Structure formats: structure tokens, C-alpha cells
Amino acid sequence: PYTVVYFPVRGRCAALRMLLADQGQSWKEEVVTVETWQEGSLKASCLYGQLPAFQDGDLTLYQSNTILRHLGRTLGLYGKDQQEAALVDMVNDGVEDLRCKYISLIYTNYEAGKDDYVKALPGQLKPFETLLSQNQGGKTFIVGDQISFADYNLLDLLLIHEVLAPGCLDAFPLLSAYVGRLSARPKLKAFLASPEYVNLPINGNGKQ
Amino acid sequence: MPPYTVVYFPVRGRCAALRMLLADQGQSWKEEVVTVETWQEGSLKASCLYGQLPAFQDGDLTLYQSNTILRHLGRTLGLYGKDQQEAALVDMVNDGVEDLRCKYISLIYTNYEAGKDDYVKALPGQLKPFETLLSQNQGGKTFIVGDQISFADYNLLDLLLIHEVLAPGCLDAFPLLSAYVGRLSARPKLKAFLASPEYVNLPINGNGKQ
Ligand SMILES: CCCCCCSC[C@H](NC(=O)CC[C@H]([NH3+])C(=O)O)C(=O)NCC(=O)O
Numbered sequence A: 001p002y003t004v005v006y007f008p009v010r011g012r013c014a015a016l017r018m019l020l021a022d023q024g025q026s027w028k029e030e031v032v033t034v035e036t037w038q039e040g041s042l043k044a045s046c047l048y049g050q051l052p053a054f055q056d057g058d059l060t061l062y063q064s065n066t067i068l069r070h071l072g073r074t075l076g077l078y079g080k081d082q083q084e085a086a087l088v089d090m091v092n093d094g095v096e097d098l099r100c101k102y103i104s105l106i107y108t109n110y111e112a113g114k115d116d117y118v119k120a121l122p123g124q125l126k127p128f129e130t131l132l133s134q135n136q137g138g139k140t141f142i143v144g145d146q147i148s149f150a151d152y153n154l155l156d157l158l159l160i161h162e163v164l165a166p167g168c169l170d171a172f173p174l175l176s177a178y179v180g181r182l183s184a185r186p187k188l189k190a191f192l193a194s195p196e197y198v199n200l201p202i203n204g205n206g207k208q
Numbered sequence B: 001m002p003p004y005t006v007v008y009f010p011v012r013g014r015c016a017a018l019r020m021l022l023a024d025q026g027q028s029w030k031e032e033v034v035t036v037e038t039w040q041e042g043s044l045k046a047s048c049l050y051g052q053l054p055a056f057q058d059g060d061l062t063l064y065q066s067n068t069i070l071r072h073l074g075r076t077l078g079l080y081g082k083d084q085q086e087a088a089l090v091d092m093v094n095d096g097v098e099d100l101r102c103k104y105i106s107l108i109y110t111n112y113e114a115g116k117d118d119y120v121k122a123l124p125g126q127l128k129p130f131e132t133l134l135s136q137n138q139g140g141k142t143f144i145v146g147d148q149i150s151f152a153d154y155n156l157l158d159l160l161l162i163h164e165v166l167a168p169g170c171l172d173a174f175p176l177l178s179a180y181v182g183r184l185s186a187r188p189k190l191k192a193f194l195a196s197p198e199y200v201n202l203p204i205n206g207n208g209k210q
């Protein structure tokens, strides 16, 4: 019932793929090559002229976070009540802010800004360590005691930063244990080790 | 006393949309103004989750992130669509608004002088998606999604209004958006609020540019 339309990279689709895989959902991948994209017709039919695009039956959605929220809403990964839902949103928005900075670094000035970015990293990750400490001592998920779409988004963000700055999580015990714990979930573990994930570049420009 | 408290700098900025929402929905709220002096002192910043404002309090629930605040209000006040499908569409609209808002903010604080012309030239292409959304919903006669107002409407309204200040007449080429702004701006409570000193006398941005 699901179709994700995207370029052949993990990018902004990694988190939603992990979510679908971990939740045991099936989906079809519609790969869009740079050639096809530069042709122009697909772009013109996209609401904001960008991908990913997602189809749930006849519902066509755009915007990665909208897709995540939609899945969180339909699959029950949006907290147990309104208070938790608000907290889940707060976590996801924080993830999105840092993701934008990451994306900017990767595509705008990797060479020149990498050092400053890595130096500033600890300050950027602290908020998530704090959130974790306030939720049952970081023994469960980011919000509440059930997994939410924010968890998958945060997991991806942490994983790609471990590739960018190996060991950046060493100074954060809760985050470190969190990544290990989530990465150990049966279906997610199988997915993260599959060619489907491993053989796709993280970003489109060969930088990471 | 009011259950809501918005903590922010004395500017409209990322709080304009939520204020319009509260006002239009007849809600009461307390404004906790943070001056640049107080902020540079450091203690408040250190207590903020991501080291930034706005901050929002609903009873003992302290929230950060403007869009989280909007979604929370949309969820508790019933401004999030009539069902899941609409909720997804509302999110899609809001995310689009957020993307353009970031570009606007970047222009305003990063290089207003140098980039203003290019930005205004690219504007029509950026607004088209919203005109399209409007055309697909009862011919743009009601709201952005469905037939009931959502938090996305307030966010979009603010975005359109601030762009009308940046590039006067930018909405002329978009009949649906133009009528939409006029229609929403005419709602009783919202109209009263937009004309109040509380709104009018607050600068749009913090650096005096708009
Ligand atoms: C080519 C391989 C690298 C691909 C990089 C990732 S896609 C980047 C871009 N899409 C976005 O930035 C999506 C942003 C949107 N806010 C979301 O979160 O979904 C796009 O479609 N860009 C195409 C365009 O704008 O023309």
C-alpha cells in the first residue's frame, strides 16, 4: 500500500524506511535517477518541486516529516496521549534543525566547515542526552515507554553523525546505549545490515 | 489566570502565527517578554532545551519549537483536520510554509541587501504551490485544507502577510491567495487582533529589516 519515490540515496528517506522495516510493513521503492529528474516532468508534478514523495493508497504526500507524522499517526507511533505527542513533535523538530545544518555542511561547504561543525557537535547533541535522562533514566525510548516516529528519525541522525565524526557519541552514555539498544531490534537490525540500506550512499554528492 | 504563557523576544517572528491562532480562537494567554539584555545574561538560554525561544507553557507542560507549539494547539483546540487524511495534508502545508519561512529568515538576517532582488524574483515560484493547494480545495473558497480552519492556515496567513511587506503586490498574480488573505484577515477576532497595538507595534523581525 506504500510507495516511496526518491533518489538512490538514504538521505531524508532513511528514517521512514527504518520505521516501515521495523514495523514489519511492506513498501515499493520507486527510484528516480538524476537523469530522469533533470528531464523535468516529474519535478513539475511534485507539489514543492522536490522529493521524497510518498503514496499510501491514493494519498500522495510530500515532505519527509509529513510522511513520518502520517506513519506515526496511522501506525500508532505518536505517543500515548496529547502530552506525549507534543513531546514527540518537539524531539522531531530538534532533529530536523540539526539535520538541516548537516545537509548544509554536506552540500554547501564540507571541506571548509567540517572542523567547526564537529567542534560545535557536542552542544548540538546535549539536548537529546538531556531528554533521554528525563525519561526513565534513558532506559527506554526518547519519549514515553513506546517507540515513536521521532526515535527512528533521531536514530538516523545519530548514525550519520557517527560516520561524519567517529566517536562523537562517546561523551554521551545515554545516547550511546540508546543507539545500541535500538539498533538491536530484530527487524531493524536485519534491515540495517541489508544491501538495500548498506549499498545506498548516505548523501548524493559522495560526502559523509 | 490564563493556562498559556508564550516566552519570546519582543518581535512577531516565529510567534506571530500562534498568537493569531490564540486570538482568533478566543484564548487568553500571558506574554513573557525576554529582552536582548536578559537573554545575553545567559541563564535563561541555558535552561532552554535547544538554547532558543519561543518557549510555551500550557499548565505545567513546557514546550519549545514554534511548530510543536502550533501542532499542540491544533491538537488540543481541534484545528488539525477532520480525520487522518486531512491531518496529513495540514502537516504537508505547514512543512511547506516552514521551508519558505527559513529562506525568509535567512534573507532577513544573513544578507538582506545583497539577496533581496534574487529572492523576490524567485518568490512567484515559491508561492505557486499554495495557490495550487487552494485551487484543489473547493476552488479556494474556504481554507487551505478541508472546510474548517487549521493551525496551518494561521501559519500560512502570517507568511503571506510578511511577504506582502517585503515585496508589496507579490500576491497580485495569485487570485486565490489574495482572496484567501482578505477572507481570513476579515474574521472578527483576528481582525481586532491584527489592528491592536499588541501586534502592530511589535517589529516583524529583530534586526529592523522587513
Ligand atoms: C541527487 C542526489 C542527492 C539528492 C539529495 C536529497 S533530495 C534534495 C531535495 N529535496 C529536499 O530537500 C526535500 C526537503 C523537504 N522539506 C523534505 O523534508 O522532504 C530535492 O528533491 N532536490 C531536487 C530539486 O530541488 O531539484
Ligand SMILES: CCCCCCSC[C@H](NC(=O)CC[C@H]([NH3+])C(=O)O)C(=O)NCC(=O)O
Binding pocket: A093, A097, B009, B010, B011, B013, B014, B036, B045, B051, B052, B053, B054, B064, B065, B066, B067, B205, B206, B207
Ligand atoms: C533578538 C530579537 C530577534 C529574535 C529573532 C527570533 S528568535 C531566533 C532564535 N530562535 C529560533 O530560531 C527558533 C527556531 C526553532 N526551530 C523554532 O521553530 O522555534 C533564538 O532564540 N536565538 C537566540 C539564540 O540562539 O541565542
